[PDB]
Write a protein that binds this ligand. Structure first.
Ligand SMILES: Cc1noc(C)c1-c1cc(O)cc(CN2CCC(F)(F)CC2)c1
Length: 127
């Protein structure tokens, strides 16, 4: 169970724009979660080899992580905020699907998700 390639973070064919909602997602939302004490397991793709999780990529077919999200934001990969929000949701859902409801990693993801929802509650209107 080698790891898959990471999710793409740039694509020369995918259209680009800089907007204030995407800026908010990078500067406020991602920033807040990134620097949180629970961020670190989520700051890069799950390395199922180093973590000895041979079934991870049998269960999780749409991996996602904040490192990927950060690069996507930095690279103007997203056209709109919803695309980015979807990736955060994917990351949290994967964690909840793969792990058991007691688990420390799940509590960590719940805390980040609560914070995520607070910051997305205040997304600015598009200029
Ligand atoms: C995210 C994610 N989703 O599913 C898995 C499995 C991971 C995961 C990713 C990591 O980079 C490291 C660990 C180990 N874990 C960290 C927190 C802890 F609470 F300390 C327990 C050990 C788990």
């Amino acid at each position: 169970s080698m790891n898959p390639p990471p999710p793409e973070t740039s694509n020369p064919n995918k259209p680009k724009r800089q907007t204030n909602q995407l800026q908010y997602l990078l500067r406020v939302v991602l920033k807040t979660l990134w620097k949180h004490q629970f961020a670190w397991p989520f700051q890069q793709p799950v390395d199922a080899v180093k973590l000895n999780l041979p079934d991870y990529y049998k269960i999780i077919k749409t991996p996602m992580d904040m490192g990927t999200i950060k690069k996507r934001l930095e690279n103007n990969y997203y056209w709109n905020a919803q695309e980015c929000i979807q990736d955060f949701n994917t990351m949290f859902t994967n964690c909840y699907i793969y792990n058991k409801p007691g688990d420390d990693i799940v509590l960590m993801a719940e805390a980040l998700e609560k914070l995520f929802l607070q910051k997305i509650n205040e997304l600015p209107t598009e200029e």
